[PDB]
Amino acid sequence: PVYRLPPLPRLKVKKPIIRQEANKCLVLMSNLLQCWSSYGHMSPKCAGLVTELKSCTSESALGKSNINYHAARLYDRINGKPHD
Amino acid sequence: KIDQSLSKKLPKGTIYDPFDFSMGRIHLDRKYQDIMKSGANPLEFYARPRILSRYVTSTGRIQHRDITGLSAKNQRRLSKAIRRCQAIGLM
Amino acid sequence: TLAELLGRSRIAQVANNHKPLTYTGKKFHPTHQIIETKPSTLYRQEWGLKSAIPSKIKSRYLVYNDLDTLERITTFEPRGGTQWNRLRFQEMGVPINPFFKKFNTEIIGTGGLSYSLPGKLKNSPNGVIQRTVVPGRILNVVKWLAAIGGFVADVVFFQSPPSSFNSMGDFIRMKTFLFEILEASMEKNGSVSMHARLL
Amino acid sequence: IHVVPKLPNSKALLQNGVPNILSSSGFKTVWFDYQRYLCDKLTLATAGQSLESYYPFHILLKTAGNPLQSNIFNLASSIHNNHLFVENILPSAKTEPSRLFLSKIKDSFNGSDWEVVKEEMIYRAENEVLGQGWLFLVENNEKKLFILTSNNNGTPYYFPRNQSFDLNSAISIDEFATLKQMKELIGKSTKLNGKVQDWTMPIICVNLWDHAYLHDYGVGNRSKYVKNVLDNLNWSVVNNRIFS
Amino acid sequence: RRIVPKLATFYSANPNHEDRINRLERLLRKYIKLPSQAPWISFDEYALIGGGTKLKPTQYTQLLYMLNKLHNIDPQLTNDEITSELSQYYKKIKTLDEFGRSIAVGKRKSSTAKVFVVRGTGEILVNGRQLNDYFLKMKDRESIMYPLQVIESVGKYNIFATTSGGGPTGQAESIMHAIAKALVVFNPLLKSRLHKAGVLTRDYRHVER
Amino acid sequence: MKIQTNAVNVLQRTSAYLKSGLLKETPAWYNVVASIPPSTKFTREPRFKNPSNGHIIGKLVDVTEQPHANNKGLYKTRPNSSDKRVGVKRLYRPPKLTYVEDRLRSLFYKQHPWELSRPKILVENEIGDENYDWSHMLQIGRPLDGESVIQRTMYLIKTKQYGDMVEAYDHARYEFYALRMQEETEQQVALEEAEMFGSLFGVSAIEHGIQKEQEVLDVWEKKVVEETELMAA
Amino acid sequence: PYPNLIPSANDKPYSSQELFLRQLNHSMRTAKLGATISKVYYPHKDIFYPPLPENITVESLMSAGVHLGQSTSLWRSSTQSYIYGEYKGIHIIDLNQTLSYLKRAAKVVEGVSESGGIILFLGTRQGQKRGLEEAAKKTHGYYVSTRWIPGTLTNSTEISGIWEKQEIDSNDNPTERALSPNETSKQVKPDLLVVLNPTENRNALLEAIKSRVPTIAIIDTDSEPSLVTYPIPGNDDSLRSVNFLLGVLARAGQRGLQNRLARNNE
Amino acid sequence: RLNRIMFENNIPGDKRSQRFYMKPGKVAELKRSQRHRKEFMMGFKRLIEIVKDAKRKGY
Numbered sequence A: 001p002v003y004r005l006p007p008l009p010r011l012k013v014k015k016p017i018i019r020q021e022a023n024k025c026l027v028l029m030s031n032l033l034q035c036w037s038s039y040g041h042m043s044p045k046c047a048g049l050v051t052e053l054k055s056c057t058s059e060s061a062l063g064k065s066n067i068n069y070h071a072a073r074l075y076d077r078i079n080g081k082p083h084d
Numbered sequence B: 001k002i003d004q005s006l007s008k009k010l011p012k013g014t015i016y017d018p019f020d021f022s023m024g025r026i027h028l029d030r031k032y033q034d035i036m037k038s039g040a041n042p043l044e045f046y047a048r049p050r051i052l053s054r055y056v057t058s059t060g061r062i063q064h065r066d067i068t069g070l071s072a073k074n075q076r077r078l079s080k081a082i083r084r085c086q087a088i089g090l091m
Numbered sequence C: 001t002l003a004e005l006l007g008r009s010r011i012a013q014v015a016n017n018h019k020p021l022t023y024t025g026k027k028f029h030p031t032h033q034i035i036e037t038k039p040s041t042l043y044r045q046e047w048g049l050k051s052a053i054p055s056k057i058k059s060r061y062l063v064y065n066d067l068d069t070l071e072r073i074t075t076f077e078p079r080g081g082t083q084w085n086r087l088r089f090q091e092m093g094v095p096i097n098p099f100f101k102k103f104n105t106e107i108i109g110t111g112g113l114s115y116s117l118p119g120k121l122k123n124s125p126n127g128v129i130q131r132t133v134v135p136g137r138i139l140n141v142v143k144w145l146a147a148i149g150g151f152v153a154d155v156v157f158f159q160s161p162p163s164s165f166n167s168m169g170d171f172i173r174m175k176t177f178l179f180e181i182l183e184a185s186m187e188k189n190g191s192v193s194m195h196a197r198l199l
Numbered sequence D: 001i002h003v004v005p006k007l008p009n010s011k012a013l014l015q016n017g018v019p020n021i022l023s024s025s026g027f028k029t030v031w032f033d034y035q036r037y038l039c040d041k042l043t044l045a046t047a048g049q050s051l052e053s054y055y056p057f058h059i060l061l062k063t064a065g066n067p068l069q070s071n072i073f074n075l076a077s078s079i080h081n082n083h084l085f086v087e088n089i090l091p092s093a094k095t096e097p098s099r100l101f102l103s104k105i106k107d108s109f110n111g112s113d114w115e116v117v118k119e120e121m122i123y124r125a126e127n128e129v130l131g132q133g134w135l136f137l138v139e140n141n142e143k144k145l146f147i148l149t150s151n152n153n154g155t156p157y158y159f160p161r162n163q164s165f166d167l168n169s170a171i172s173i174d175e176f177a178t179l180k181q182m183k184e185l186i187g188k189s190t191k192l193n194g195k196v197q198d199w200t201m202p203i204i205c206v207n208l209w210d211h212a213y214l215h216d217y218g219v220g221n222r223s224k225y226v227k228n229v230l231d232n233l234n235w236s237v238v239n240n241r242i243f244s
Numbered sequence E: 001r002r003i004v005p006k007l008a009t010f011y012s013a014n015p016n017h018e019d020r021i022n023r024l025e026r027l028l029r030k031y032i033k034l035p036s037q038a039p040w041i042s043f044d045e046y047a048l049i050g051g052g053t054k055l056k057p058t059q060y061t062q063l064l065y066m067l068n069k070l071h072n073i074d075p076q077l078t079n080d081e082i083t084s085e086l087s088q089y090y091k092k093i094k095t096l097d098e099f100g101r102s103i104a105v106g107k108r109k110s111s112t113a114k115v116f117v118v119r120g121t122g123e124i125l126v127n128g129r130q131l132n133d134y135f136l137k138m139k140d141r142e143s144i145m146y147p148l149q150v151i152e153s154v155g156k157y158n159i160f161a162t163t164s165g166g167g168p169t170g171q172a173e174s175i176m177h178a179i180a181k182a183l184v185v186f187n188p189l190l191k192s193r194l195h196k197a198g199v200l201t202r203d204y205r206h207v208e209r
Numbered sequence F: 001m002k003i004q005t006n007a008v009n010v011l012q013r014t015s016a017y018l019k020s021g022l023l024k025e026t027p028a029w030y031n032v033v034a035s036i037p038p039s040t041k042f043t044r045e046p047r048f049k050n051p052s053n054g055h056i057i058g059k060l061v062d063v064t065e066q067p068h069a070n071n072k073g074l075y076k077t078r079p080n081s082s083d084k085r086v087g088v089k090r091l092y093r094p095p096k097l098t099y100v101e102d103r104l105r106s107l108f109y110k111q112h113p114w115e116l117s118r119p120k121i122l123v124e125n126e127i128g129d130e131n132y133d134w135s136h137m138l139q140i141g142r143p144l145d146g147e148s149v150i151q152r153t154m155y156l157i158k159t160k161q162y163g164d165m166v167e168a169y170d171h172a173r174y175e176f177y178a179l180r181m182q183e184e185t186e187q188q189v190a191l192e193e194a195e196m197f198g199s200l201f202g203v204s205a206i207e208h209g210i211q212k213e214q215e216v217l218d219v220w221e222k223k224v225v226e227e228t229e230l231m232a233a
Numbered sequence G: 001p002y003p004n005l006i007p008s009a010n011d012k013p014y015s016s017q018e019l020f021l022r023q024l025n026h027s028m029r030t031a032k033l034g035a036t037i038s039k040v041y042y043p044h045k046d047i048f049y050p051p052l053p054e055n056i057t058v059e060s061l062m063s064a065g066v067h068l069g070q071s072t073s074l075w076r077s078s079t080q081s082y083i084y085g086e087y088k089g090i091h092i093i094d095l096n097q098t099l100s101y102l103k104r105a106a107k108v109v110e111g112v113s114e115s116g117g118i119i120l121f122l123g124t125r126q127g128q129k130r131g132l133e134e135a136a137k138k139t140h141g142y143y144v145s146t147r148w149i150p151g152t153l154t155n156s157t158e159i160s161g162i163w164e165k166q167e168i169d170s171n172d173n174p175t176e177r178a179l180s181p182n183e184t185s186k187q188v189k190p191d192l193l194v195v196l197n198p199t200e201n202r203n204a205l206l207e208a209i210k211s212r213v214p215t216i217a218i219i220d221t222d223s224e225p226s227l228v229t230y231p232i233p234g235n236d237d238s239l240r241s242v243n244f245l246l247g248v249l250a251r252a253g254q255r256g257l258q259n260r261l262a263r264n265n266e
Numbered sequence H: 001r002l003n004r005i006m007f008e009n010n011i012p013g014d015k016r017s018q019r020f021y022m023k024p025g026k027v028a029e030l031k032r033s034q035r036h037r038k039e040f041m042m043g044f045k046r047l048i049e050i051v052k053d054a055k056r057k058g059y
């Protein structure tokens, strides 16, 4: 079924959700802590992770949507309003 | 191995494009994912709890027409059949 | 009259269809006529349709459903991919007869995929080509499945897979193999079933 | 649609052919029928496609690198070649080689005379073109004039489609090494089409196809025909074809 | 006779800019085939001849784009037409002295330094005194040596530095700066590397209440 | 929107200005517009025939003109409720243009789905320049595609060489196959002959597809590894 | 011919610029050998070789796509009399009426250009600048393609009053006379406005109505016909159809201008 | 999983709504309001999908 809307004052998303890419540093840190929990602290089985962690957090410890713009730009064109 | 969600299985005998080897294809597949959707009258299944237990919830609540996708007439007939089945000691 | 010319016009030559432009099921054959433009017309957004196609489209091929809609746009996709599959099949040389001596809607023979006749040899500077070699990609661990020239085919081995298969795993598709396309028939659905063998 | 060009003095060409090379029924075979045949085939092979808007030279450059369009390329090549040849044997639109042409001959062919280079061209056409082909005197980007012999409908502009070697018969290791080097150079290109730059341009073109000599000369005697062609070139055109 | 608007773009928002862009486009369109390979007037200077207050920054960037495209045409194949149309929009080498010395001046904080660099064997005097005598801190000597170390030319030059003002660090770093500037003269090709080391940049920082 | 009055009467208002003296000089357009009047009716106009198929619009068949029993055996002796409703709207509704060729265009591409993969150019060259004799299928200035088949079918029908559209369509189909096989053999043999004389091609279609798949698959690998590492944490 | 080019020496090869000039020499002489192209559409030729109004057929209007109207779901029913039918979910414009209206509008343009009036070509869609500029330049007219400032006619003093004006003779030759500030400040109203996209240019149409300027427009299936003096039913969405109609009008204006100059030279 | 079942059967919502009595007219108007809001969200999502499509094609 198609649910057409009445003429709206606007076409806007209240809180557009964005692509929050996860920080690589935190993922590496979580993997290393999991490794230490399983294989013991200062284990040699994930020294690579430690190395990688050291390499990625070395300089910095931590290593917007456009929908509203296009919706406002295109609303009059696509809304299917009858002619004046 | 990798998670099966992150991979795409191209079926057999089907043509494809290079685009199909990409996360775009999987994402487009996710976004774009019977007996009553036919000439059959659902009111003839009021004595068949197995068939019309498919159109209810685990607790037994009839599913909205938005879910079942049936026509208005067949939604009404199915609801009538389910309620009658509940009344006659089945269901 | 204008009506006769409209019946003969190029827009009228494209058969009506409203199949979804974003189909996510199984593709056995083309569903939409590919529309092409010359560079000179593309520079001016001209495609022979009603409305100018947006300048974002740099490709010279598209498929479309509706010339105009209530949304004041043309429903189109800037894709002409199915021509490259067909041509790639023509490069393979493997052939697939109803092309020889009220209405039936079933696909006739090959549905225009190939018109090559069965028995012919490919002369080469080496000599007559005995068998057809083609690059391809093993897809998944399973007759295995291979992406070859825009078609999914069945792979059969001489004796068994090599160590690279299980060494790579689900990344096996990243590396290119060589295949011999044994044969190619087409089924009732319109799907081509090539049988190949890894080399 | 591709249409056969109108030639200067077409009435005289239909009445008495080309003096000293072709009779009327020979020039009709090579131009008024062969060029029509080729233009019709090109039209049928390119109509309803982008290539219909392009001249045959541009068509052959566009389709030179695409294996499946070879037939179109062949047509687009022969048409082009067939007008390069006819143009430089037409009586007019006493012409003599320019000083610049002879100077470049002396700087290319080991300080040889024009007649000696003509004899070399006769020899080259006699040997390296079995059956159909084209004979060219071409200028490379090095300002060097050299003799090029293409088989069938090879082009003088684009070296990967010169088709100067007959691989049906045995070839010398020198020719095989040449092919290997050209293949490597083709692979060296970064463009996705796989094309290369080639600034070679034809100065002289002679049609070694049976449509040119067979009626007036015979199965043999193509050397006589090529000699008549090279002794009776339209040197106004040939001189204009060299960059000043 | 008849009074008509002068430009074909008279009814546009900014007719002057459109007219000038039309002329530039006409030239860029006639000579489109020519291959390719610039002090253009400023935004205000273009506003005088174009829209004035009407002129927009995007319009000025379009003008610059057209002018750059025309200018970048290969100089050998340009003609009088392009150059004539483009002209409307156009807006002491150091050496050694008689004694072979490169003389340079550097400043840091309230310190100043004048250095005479001559080719030599890595000798240095500061105010007529040995380097270790004048500069007690090693890091000051390392600062003075750093530009010569950048170009690997410690041991190839004699330095006669003379400082005044400020304190040891300021004087050492003004000598460093002066040496770098002097060294550029002996081999200009090394300037970039010295500029990359940071020794040709005058340190602006000073005491600020 | 209301039918506007002031765009088509600029001459009358201008002449009132000129007669009163409010405007001194006559405009340059004045005499031109005076000599070329605008159309000022803006009416809806009925139509009585479908342009495409020749169906007459606005005729009612009377009971006298149906003197024979219908398919259910019943005579028509009085008008039905449809005949009694005024059908004036049909006279003004823009008629739907219909052509049998469209039914026959749909069939062809259902029978030959891979003919849809042959690119088509909808940019017309010049419809007036077309002089085709459809006694044969190949035409100078045209490609070989489904429209050739269908135009040949229509030609065969209008000359009554066949009575049934099915047989004419089948005949056209077989001619089309005859031409397509020749074209494909021409292409294959041209490539073979080219290779036999030292034509060195670069990337072919298969290698083109391989390289595009590789370009896509590199990005896919990177995304897969990143997602797996993220999932593990 | 080619100044400031330094040739190369005979010993050394061609340079890049020498190669460019060499292949130009090839291009102008031999690159076009082999066949002449006939009955093939070239987009630029609609602008530089538009036909005369008397030579236009229904077939050439149809090949330009002028007949392709808006979707039937966006129909403005006041355009009912212009429509030939519906086909593939859009309305088809009756090209016989398009041809009649186009000839009428072309004659209006020719008459206004022959009278020495000002002609303005308005089109604000993406790729319409080239055709508008060429129409203006061959009619000795004016054009806008960027944006129509509202009030350009009804508020001309505040908008167009600052731009310069010029006295010209019967032959359109600049006289270079000095104008008074009062003369420079006056409104200079177009004698004819032609708008290629009237649906997106209602401001201009209304100003022309108020300022009492006759107007021509391409009227699509969703456009109001009564808002213009001389409608032309046709497709306003295709650059080919728009450029075809515009080139026709521009050539009619050019013929009017040529006639004016001819009698002024006799 | 259990909590998903709870929300999928509206069990918490029904328990909250059964706490106090609501007059049948108020129930009817709340029902109309909720259905309208649902249909409005469906239409809004359709329009946003059209916006994304048109943006991708370049409109």
Ligand SMILES: [Mg+2]
Binding pocket: G070, G220, G221, G222, G235, G236, G237
């Ligand atoms: Mg429109």
